Design a protein around this ligand. Structure first.
Ligand code: F43
Ligand SMILES: C[C@@H](OP(=O)(O)O)[C@H](NC(=O)/C=C\CCCCSSCCS(=O)(=O)O)C(=O)O
Ligand SMILES: C[C@@H](OP(=O)(O)O)[C@H](NC(=O)CCCCCCS)C(=O)O
Ligand SMILES: O=S(=O)(O)CCS
Lengths: 259, 442, 550, 442, 50
């Protein structure tokens, strides 16, 4: 068959982007945050109540006989009629292990039936609540995709992805939803992603050291690995741009001879 | 004749219909079914008799939240629906044997009228149908219930809502698939003004049929806009054949191969099929080992990518059973395909940009709304020439009821009226038949 | 290393611009800004007096503002600083007058009217008669009624900004006319520019009518053309006394106020339904011609950047900020293009690179030069963002970074080739290269026109093809999203600044907006925005003489 | 049949052609000639090759006083103009037995292209003709002269001109008889866009043929607007027959009877003919004499009054040999008739209102333009449903060169293009022949 | 003319229904009072987020 190559480039950042894009690549496990803690950090529901429902379970409701629709297996949260909720992150530009477009591409190439939205200040995923919690705790939180210092889950007032870190190597947050504690070195979340305070702060773990962050980040930086050091990515980008321009002008094989 | 590439034909169930069909057999300029659909979409009008009765009984003329006290008429349009339909048919009939039909829908609660084609031959545009139907309805209501001479104005306001003052039919109870010509954002955009919800409701929420309907409308519009002429015609012909009618069973094959997969798996399947069919070849091998690809056939690669985009949208929105993933899937299918192969996207980035704006306006405060209220005439989704809307229709068909502006909320009268015609409800099986009819003429 | 944006970063930030760390949550919130405190006091007084207790401004609700240091804003090429609130188009009278002057301008040619008067109407036309007509139209345009005391007239102090001016490419007629109301091309433009403009215009005479600002304030932009036409017709039938019949008067009316009318903007269709002389109908070339920096400067980068600033302040702040969205608006989106010398530094680097490699205009527009110039400029700008953390803090939004880098790349490409579509192609390549570099771009959709651009830059299809000078806010790709149009106008200007052209799209607009009688002088838009941010700009359209003093 | 009305057809010289012709034989929905003229108007496009060459040579892209320095292309379009025509025809060609008429005008400086009907059968509006012609012209110009990839935008601006920004063809060199559907006064107003000067120039200043052209266009438009539906169809058919096609020779008879007469004498002859034909009878005689008149046939009386209006315009403007009298003639013809008989005027006062519109539009400083640029798609002249415009054609045909908006100044290209078609040059004769061809089917 | 031009009436019933059935947020008169307090600050041009 065809063996995918995901991204171009031979630099370390390109390799990290390829690993994030690769669904067969096992993300390194770094933390262990229990499901209840993650659920209460998201703030959509309290751990202990049943899942709210936006439409009756797919078994109870009746649908027309659609061959092309019924041969795709739905998510477990979809057949239960669970409501669609979100988890949103802000990734610092200073060597955060995951980046907005990288996060979106990895999520769309790894998860089933998710809606990924990329932006400069934040990246958001929307899915059925049960599946959202499951994949969030399994992948987004206790893996290399999350750094408690350079990445924080913020549902509103996202600002600090491009700001300088504070004296603790920690991202700026207007709502201050997560707090660094000195006498343990751990990071504690005192509010949910929207900003509602929690009953008890939840510990997410120690921040990743900067030296480790340098070799696992997916961002090109002058101080880190630069795009000038990876000419293949630039060449591929220029080829894509030229192909787009030629196809826009005249979409024929003769026009594409000047590719 | 001028295109030597043949295509196969598969139904919505993936069964083979015919092979070696010329590409021009599905062309809007040659296919009899597409011509018939365009002709019938211009002359079919939906009438809300129950809406007329309710508006007149409460004096609800004016539009949103508007009442005129004193201008109240008590009529029984729904009870006298047969007589009203007969009078409208008599008024609109040209001679004897024209294609004038006024069928009764929902026990007289709705009317589906078809003005004769002879009334449209000497008409410059399609607005003659709605105006003629409005006048016929006014006359039928005036002469059935002996309405006073000083209340014909109220009747007119009930049938069309503000037309002389507002160049539209907003508060009225008369509707059509196409919008008013004053709502067009560009010349030739008349066939692009069909919202996704209208197409989904017309096809009764059938994914493949909705894809076929939306793709046929969009590509016929591109022919009308003058975009698909000269050297641009083959690209749109292949886009219609592959994305919209699954010519080589590409859409069904990709969906079957990715029943429990993600968007990246669909991208990989598309690239593998393109390599196997010879559409794309390895241009060069870079220093890092990246294999840059070039298209051996540019338009065929475009068609393959569009079919894969439809399949990816179907897979993702069937896994989620929610129609809010459309913009993200359309964006990132192209985004990962381009940087996996080095090849341009579905429409040389024109569909990806449509997705970047669709994601803007479907998740923000600045406008837009649910995916079902968008169309090819919309300022947000007009940028891709018929390669982004059929995926939206498929995804809205896959929705399980998580959208407030569902087709039931938006297109109730239009969907119910236009679902009664087999050509509109199942465009796939009739476009295939039309292509088979002219298979041997090329 | 020496950078043009370094001084502003030193003034704005207390720490070193290269320092990677700082401290927050110690500024007192909104109290750190004098503008916010003034707003609080004004809100208290306004509520208590006029609002009878209904709350208006409550900083305590919503986001706690001022958790970080609210930076001041420089203005490029100007040595004055202002808060970000002073640059809001509602709080800045300079931006409001910038839009007012463009809105209230209509150019009407008077050569068909003169020919109809001479031949059909049998009335001689002389420079003395032209001077008499100019006197009549100057009295009658604001609110006047000629030799009719019984007729209601507008208060003269209410329309002090209304003028009627004349200019012509005929030299002898120009020097035979009164200098009180003449726009002299010879003394307003350099010799070569004046010669080029006279050759382009011809031997024809044009009148410029500046409808009073209050008329555009009360009404919409489509009122200006009707007001101008009505006053021109009245003044023409009053100065020249004609004993012909009334049909002949209809022919003369067509020749005088509906034959050679030039409008600033066109009407918009569909959901942007608007009349003429609205900011969504102004083409990029027209806006480049409105700005007059080719008159007083020979630097191409400065000429392009003044147009960039004007286009940002119009398109992003007024048009898209309020006309299309409303609310707080998109001030910081447009100010990033003209506040600090970040865009100035990037554009100067692009010009230097083009001059060193390809010459000033030494290459025909090919794909390879577009790719290499755009890539080099984009890489330089992105590494400049990388190695100056204060710069990244200043441009916190990715949209206020992508637009700046892409504008620099497009200006560089336009310098190298002289073609505006090549410049916009370089802009789009810069955008996608930025996206791959930082794994980031602007907002959600934001890059709808940047993924669609590469294909639409050199397209030949009906709704996709247009020269960048002929494009504008009504171009289908550019209709909605912020952060592009103001830079598109600058790229279109840079396409002609490389050739040393006297104008870009319309010589008549260029001559008309060189008028010294304009309230907003378009020679230095940045300086006037700076003046307005300091509450030292005298705007028009104020109804001070018809309102009580209490 | 549903109308028992019979008419006798007379040619432009006052000679009898046929008798007892059914009234519906001249209906737009039945007459083959009217169908052919509508189709030809929809599919005909005029190209100004000399204008394209001049715009590209001087860089005059962009409209009124606009010019882009540096974007100048030096091509010889008029020199080639057979090559370009052949390439455009090849691009626009759909089939072999296909219309696709591209013909050289004025020795290469103009093109008269007829888009095939196949591209219009699958179009919801008429705008496909201009867009397809513009695209084909762009491709032909780019291919014939090897234009660089970076000047296709300049070529597009020279051909179409500001279209994406300005939703129209303003500074372009391609034109059609119908304007943009988004720039209509109302719905169905597309066919009332041909000005009086175009009708006069197409018919080569023939009074009866210009009247027939204007009346045919106006009444076909009324059929399109839904106005001539049900009870109004008879009145519009009678108006067309008696005002445009000189049915019963009324117009010629009135003109002959008032060769030396005035408007009042024309009114007297009209009333005498109406009384003699039984159209109007005496209602009652008042105390002060003045026997009131009531119509025994309302629609026939309106038709007689319209024919008399045309005759009065012809008489007055042939006495003065000037076309500036139309507004006053129509206004005071209606006034004198109303206060002479106690009967309503033409179109029940709508003709008088449109005459007031003509008066204030062409007789003051708030007047604008002359009578030659009158058309039904204007806010000033839209009020009469095809009863006030055709007389203006007679008035402008009778003008002895005393108008600034003469047909030679404003419609030279239109006349050169559309005068080649027989049905456009002599609408009266060919409409009569087409009505004769369908006499027996009623 | 200014008062007529600047007046827009918005029906706040569909938004409440979406808040109730899609976002699972309960709408009470206290919440409506809080919303009114917020919008009287936001509509003139005050900042609530960002
Ligand atoms: C709520 C929205 C959704 C939307 O449609 N607009 C918002 C908010 C809106 C409001 C701000 C209301 C207020 O002051 O509270 C307005 C002013 C639009 C309006 N007329 O109401 C605005 N944004 Ni936004 N918005 C901006 C920006 C941005 C950048 C912020 C970069 C970052 O630090 O993360 C991001 C986009 C991103 O995804 O990256 C952004 C997002 C968002 N923006 C997101 C989420 C905000 C969040 O923090 O929770 N703005 C900027 O990049 C700077 C210019 C700034 C605009 C105002 C100005 O120019 O002063 C403002 C423009
Ligand atoms: C459509 C337009 O007419 P026009 O096309 O003939 O200019 C139309 N009316 C106008 O003529 C224009 C302006 C209104 C002027 C009327 C002033 S009434 S006071 C003068 C009486 S007299 O001059 O006739 O003696 C309008 O714009 O409202
Ligand atoms: C898309 C469309 O919104 P609607 O869904 O039609 O209401 C359109 N908005 C816009 O153009 C928003 C432009 C300004 C706000 C965003 C700037 S990035 C408009 O108002 O007509
Ligand atoms: O970021 S969003 O696209 O929501 C709006 C930017 S102001």
């Amino acid at each position: 068959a065809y063996t995918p190559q995901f991204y171009p480039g031979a630099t370390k950042v390109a390799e990290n982007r390829r690993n994030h894009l690769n669904p067969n690549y096992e993300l390194e496990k770094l933390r262990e945050i229990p499901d209840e803690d993650v659920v209460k950090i998201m703030g959509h529901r309290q751990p202990g109540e049943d899942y709210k429902t936006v439409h009756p379970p797919l078994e109870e409701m009746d649908f027309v006989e659609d061959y092309a629709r019924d041969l795709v297996e739905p998510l477990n949260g979809a057949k239960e009629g669970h409501r669609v909720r979100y988890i949103q992150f802000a990734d610092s530009m200073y060597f955060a292990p995951a980046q907005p477009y990288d996060r979106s591409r990895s999520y769309m190439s790894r998860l089933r039936g998710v809606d990924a939205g990329t932006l400069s200040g934040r990246q958001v995923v929307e899915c059925r609540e049960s599946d959202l919690e499951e994949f969030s705790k399994n992948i987004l939180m206790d893996t290399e995709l999350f750094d408690p210092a350079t990445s924080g889950m913020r549902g509103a007032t996202v600002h600090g992805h491009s700001l300088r870190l504070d004296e603790n190597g920690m991202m700026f947050d207007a709502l201050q939803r997560c707090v660094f504690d000195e006498k343990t070195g751990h990071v504690m979340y005192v509010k949910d992603q929207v900003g509602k305070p929690l009953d008890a702060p939840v510990d997410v773990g120690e921040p990743i050291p900067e030296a480790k962050l340098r070799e696992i980040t997916t961002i090109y930086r002058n101080d880190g690995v630069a795009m000038r050091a990876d000419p293949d990515v630039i060449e591929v980008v220029k080829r894509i741009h030229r192909a787009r321009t030629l196809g826009g002008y005249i979409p024929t094989n003769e026009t594409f001879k000047g590719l | 004749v001028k295109y030597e590439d043949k295509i196969s034909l598969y139904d919505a169930k993936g069964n083979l219909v015919a092979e070696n069909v010329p590409l021009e057999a599905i062309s809007p300029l040659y296919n009899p079914t597409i011509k018939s659909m365009v002709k019938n979409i211009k002359r079919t009008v939906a009438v809300n008799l129950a809406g007329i009765e309710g508006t007149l009984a409460a004096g609800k003329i004016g539009g949103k939240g508007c009442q005129v006290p004193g201008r109240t008429l008590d009529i029984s349009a729904v009870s006298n629906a047969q007589a009203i339909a007969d009078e409208v048919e008599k008024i609109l009939k040209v001679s004897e044997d024209d294609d004038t039909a006024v069928k009764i829908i929902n026990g007289g609660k709705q009317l589906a009228v078809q003005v004769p084609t002879a009334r449209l031959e000497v008409a410059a545009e399609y607005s003659v149908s709605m105006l003629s139907t409005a006048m016929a309805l006014k006359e039928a209501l005036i002469k059935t219930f002996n309405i006073d001479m000083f209340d014909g104005s109220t009747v007119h306001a009930a049938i069309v809502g503000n037309y002389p003052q507002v160049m539209d039919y907003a508060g009225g109870n008369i509707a059509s698939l196409l919008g008013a010509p004053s709502m067009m954002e560009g010349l030739g955009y008349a066939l692009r003004n069909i919202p996704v919800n209208h197409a989904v409701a017309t096809t009764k929420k059938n994914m493949m049929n909705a894809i076929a309907f939306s793709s046929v409308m969009e590509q016929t519009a591109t022919f009308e806009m003058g975009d698909a002429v000269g050297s641009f015609e083959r690209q749109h012909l292949l886009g219609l054949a592959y994305q919209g009618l699954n010519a080589d069973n590409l859409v069904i094959d990709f969906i079957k191969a990715n029943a429990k997969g993600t968007v990246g798996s669909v991208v990989e399947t598309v690239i593998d099929r393109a390599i196997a069919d010879g559409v794309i070849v390895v241009d060069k091998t870079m220093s890092s080992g990246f294999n840059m690809y070039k298209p051996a056939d540019v338009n065929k690669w475009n068609a393959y990518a569009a079919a894969g985009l439809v399949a990816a949208v179907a897979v993702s929105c069937g896994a989620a059973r929610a129609a809010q993933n459309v913009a993200s899937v359309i964006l990132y299918f192209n985004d990962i395909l381009e940087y996996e192969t080095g090849l341009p996207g579905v429409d040389y980035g024109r569909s990806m940009g449509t997705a970047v704006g669709f994601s803007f306006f479907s998740h923000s405060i600045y406008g837009g709304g649910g995916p079902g209220i968008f169309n090819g005439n919309h300022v947000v989704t007009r940028h891709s020439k018929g390669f982004a809307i059929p995926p939206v229709c498929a995804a809205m068909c896959a929705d399980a009821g998580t959208q407030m502006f569902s087709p039931e909320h938006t297109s109730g009268l239009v969907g119910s009226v236009y679902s009664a015609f087999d050509e509109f409800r199942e465009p796939m099986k009739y476009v295939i038949e039309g292509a088979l009819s002219i298979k041997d003429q090329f | 290393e020496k950078r043009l944006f370094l001084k502003a970063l030193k003034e704005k930030f207390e720490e070193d611009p290269k320092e990677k760390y700082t401290k927050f949550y110690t500024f007192g919130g909104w109290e750190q800004s004098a503008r916010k405190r003034e707003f609080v006091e004004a809100n208290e007084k306004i509520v208590s007096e006029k609002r009878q207790g209904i709350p208006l401004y409550n900083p305590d609700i919503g986001v706690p503002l001022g958790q970080r240091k609210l930076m001041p804003y420089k203005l490029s090429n100007t040595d004055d600083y202002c808060e970000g609130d002073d640059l809001h188009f509602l709080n800045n009278a300079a931006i409001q007058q910038l839009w007012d002057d463009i809105r209230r301008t209509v150019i009407v040619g008077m050569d068909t009217a003169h020919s109809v008067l001479e031949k059909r109407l049998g009335v001689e036309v002389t420079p003395e008669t032209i001077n008499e007509y100019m006197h009549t139209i100057n009295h009658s345009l604001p609110g006047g009624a000629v030799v009719q005391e019984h007729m209601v007239e507008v208060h003269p102090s209410l329309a002090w900004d209304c003028y009627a001016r004349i200019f012509t490419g005929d030299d002898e007629l120009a020097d035979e006319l009164d200098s009180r109301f003449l726009i002299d091309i010879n003394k307003l433009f350099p010799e070569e520019q004046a010669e080029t403009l006279k050759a382009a215009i011809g031997k024809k005479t044009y009148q410029v009518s500046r409808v009073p600002s209050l008329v555009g304030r009360v009404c919409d932009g489509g009122t200006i053309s009707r007001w101008s036409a009505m006053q021109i017709g009245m003044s023409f039938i009053t100065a020249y006394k004609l004993c012909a019949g009334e049909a002949a008067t209809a022919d003369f009316s067509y020749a005088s106020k509906h034959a050679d009318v030039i409008q600033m903007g066109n009407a918009l269709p569909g959901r942007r339904a608007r009349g003429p002389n609205e900011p969504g109908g102004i083409r990029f070339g027209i806006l480049s011609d409105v700005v007059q920096t080719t008159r007083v400067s020979e630097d191409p980068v400065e000429q392009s950047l003044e147009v960039v600033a004007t286009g940002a302040a119009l398109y992003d702040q007024i048009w898209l900020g309020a006309y299309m969205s409303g609310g707080i608006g998109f001030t910081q989106y447009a100010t990033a293009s003209y506040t600090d010398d970040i865009l100035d530094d990037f554009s100067y680097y692009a010009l230097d690179y083009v001059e060193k490699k390809y010459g000033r205009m030494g290459t025909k527009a090919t794909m390879d030069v577009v790719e290499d110039v755009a890539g080099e400029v984009t890489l330089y700008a992105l590494e400049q963002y990388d190695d100056y953390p204060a710069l990244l803090e200043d441009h916190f939004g990715g949209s206020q970074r992508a637009a700046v880098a892409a504008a620099a790349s497009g200006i560089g490409v336009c310098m190298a080739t002289g073609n505006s579509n090549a410049g916009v192609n370089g802009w789009y390549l810069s955008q996608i290269l930025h996206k791959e570099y930082h794994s980031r771009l602007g907002f959600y959709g934001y890059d709808l026109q940047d993924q669609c651009g590469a294909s639409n830059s050199l397209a030949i299809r009906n709704d996709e093809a247009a020269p960048l000078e002929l494009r504008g806010p009504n171009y289908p790709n550019y209709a909605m999203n912020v952060g592009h149009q103001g830079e598109y106008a600058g790229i279109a200007q840079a396409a002609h600044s490389a050739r040393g052209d006297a104008f870009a799209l319309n010589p008549l607009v260029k001559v008309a907006f060189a008028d010294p009688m304009l309230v907003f002088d378009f020679s230095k838009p940045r300086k006037e925005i700076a003046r307005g941010a300091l509450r030292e700009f005298e705007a028009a359209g104020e109804r001070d003489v018809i309102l009580p003093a209490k």
